[PDB]
Write a protein that binds this ligand. Structure first.
Ligand SMILES: N[C@@H](CCC(=O)N[C@@H](CSCC(=O)c1ccc(-c2ccccc2)cc1)C(=O)NCC(=O)O)C(=O)O
Ligand SMILES: N[C@@H](CCC(=O)N[C@@H](CSCC(=O)c1ccc(-c2ccccc2)cc1)C(=O)NCC(=O)O)C(=O)O
Ligand SMILES: N[C@@H](CCC(=O)N[C@@H](CSCC(=O)c1ccc(-c2ccccc2)cc1)C(=O)NCC(=O)O)C(=O)O
Ligand SMILES: CCCCCCCCO[C@@H]1O[C@H](CO)[C@@H](O)[C@H](O)[C@H]1O
Ligand SMILES: CCCCCCCCO[C@@H]1O[C@H](CO)[C@@H](O)[C@H](O)[C@H]1O
Ligand SMILES: CCCCCCCCO[C@@H]1O[C@H](CO)[C@@H](O)[C@H](O)[C@H]1O
Ligand SMILES: CCCCCCCCCCCCCCCC(=O)O
Ligand SMILES: CCCCCCCCCCCCCCCC(=O)O
Ligand SMILES: CCCCCCCCCCCCCCCC(=O)O
Lengths: 143, 143, 143
């Protein structure tokens, strides 16, 4: 499976990119003193710090959007890598996803004007939709 | 692995079903003018459209519930497909999950009376619980 | 792959642990009469029970944090199991994750003082970060 190393490289970079979002979220909570739990707020200055914050909420939305998109790619890309795609075509699917997703997180956390985030989201979903349909046909025909 | 094509067909349909929920959510935000981000609200009419909406919130709950259930199935069903189950028994596990999950999303977004959604949820979790236990025993015995 | 049974045992226990969190959340909603949907509230006593609750919110945060961490482990641990790690070293990665994650959920739902939850979270992420980097290098070198 000549496409497998490319898949594993892109996927693992995206997982690390999600870990970076978790790290950023934690740092933002600490810096803004905005905690979700009274036990956390009390350790960090008092009950008034058990509160929501727009920058924390933004981080959580970026992380959730990652879960909505990167997790399915992990499944789809892995299966697709084993079904014998042209390696260059596979590379292009994986690269468009990687670049689109990294750009999405930059656009989201960086508060870039619309529709920059929505374009990057849509661009990244294209190779996912492609892989899903290709897998669907391969599965269907082996039933 | 005679169960693998059936697994891949059901799983990929469920992923596409999750993409449809993402699409619906976006359309609902646009139609109700209810955006989570000031950059989005400003592109679409002004800051007063940076607001929550019950139909948007409902879409997000359906999508989150999908992530809580479909993602584990993707892992469990894949592993289970390789452990040599009777193919018909495997088919039944996958079909009950697929039908239960599609019904769950229809019940959720369609605002069907309780306990229709909760029944479909519980029904779909049954084959997941079954596969998890079967995998647990197979793993345990190879330790 | 001598590490595979250990991976599948730990992963499947963690999935079951996530199902337990879903079950607890449902029980808490019912016990506190705090539902997210008017159709649910109406079946269970009236519209005033369509409301948020801190214990329900806490359960949802624990479940979300599981999705943020356990799902990537399912991918990373599976790939890592096939790359020929020393089986004892692999066992240690999987065990630290399993124990850290179970402890995280106990700390979260049990409202244990800070920084108990954050320590368990960080400890569990260590083997995940390790596996991710090891996979990154293996993938990179096969490009
Ligand atoms: N969505 C989470 C993200 C941060 C988080 O999960 N925090 C922990 C407390 S630990 C402290 C921390 O912020 C943190 C963040 C990232 C990492 C890390 C990650 C990957 C590799 C290496 C290190 C280590 C520690 C928690 O239990 N949150 C409760 C919850 O999720 O509801 C949040 O809003 O709190
Ligand atoms: N839970 C999300 C769902 C929609 C979404 O993710 N929107 C993007 C902006 S893109 C516009 C769009 O709505 C959209 C939706 C689906 C698709 C699509 C999907 C699959 C295949 C093909 C096409 C393409 C575009 C975002 O960054 N949201 C910010 C966030 O998640 O916090 C939300 O509530 O916004
Ligand atoms: N995060 C969810 C967790 C509970 C849930 O998903 N509830 C269903 C209604 S079903 C009743 C139930 O609570 C329940 C919970 C767990 C299980 C179960 C799980 C695994 C194995 C075996 C059994 C079976 C039933 C729902 O549609 N919630 C709407 C939503 O997620 O927005 C919530 O806050 O409601
Ligand atoms: C590699 C580790 C870097 C992670 C950076 C996050 C640092 C901030 O972590 C903070 O720790 C507190 C401990 O009580 C928690 O209560 C807070 O919720 C959390 O934001
Ligand atoms: C296949 C593509 C169909 C997706 C339908 C979603 C269309 C609505 O997408 C909208 O785009 C805006 C761009 O600025 C965003 O700000 C909004 O959040 C989003 O709802
Ligand atoms: C194995 C099954 C045990 C799951 C325990 C959860 C029981 C509570 O489930 C309740 O069912 C109601 C039905 O209308 C829903 O409206 C509530 O949201 C849900 O909390
Ligand atoms: C992983 C990728 C991390 C993305 C970096 C975040 C970009 C923030 C841009 C500068 C801070 C402005 C804020 O808002
Ligand atoms: C994917 C499956 C999509 C589910 C379709 C949504 C059903 C909505 C029912 C009709 C609109 C009523 C609302 O509420
Ligand atoms: C799965 C692991 C389930 C974790 C059990 C929850 C611990 C709750 C501790 C006792 C109730 C106190 C509350 O708060």
């Amino acid at each position: 499976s000549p496409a497998l190393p490319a898949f594993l490289l892109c996927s693992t970079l995206l997982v690390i990119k999600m870990y970076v979002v978790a790290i950023i979220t934690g740092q933002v909570r600490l810096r803004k003193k905005a905690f979700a739990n009274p036990e956390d707020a009390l350790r960090h200055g008092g009950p008034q710090y058990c509160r929501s914050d727009p920058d924390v909420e933004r981080c959580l939305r970026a992380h959730r959007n990652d879960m909505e998109t990167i997790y399915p790619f992990l499944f789809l890309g892995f299966v697709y890598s084993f079904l014998g795609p042209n390696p260059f075509v596979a590379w292009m699917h994986f690269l468009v996803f990687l670049v689109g997703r990294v750009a999405h997180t930059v656009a989201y956390l960086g508060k870039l004007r619309a529709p920059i985030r929505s374009v990057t989201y849509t661009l990244a979903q294209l190779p996912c939709a492609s892989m899903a349909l290709q897998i669907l046909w391969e599965a269907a025909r082996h039933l």
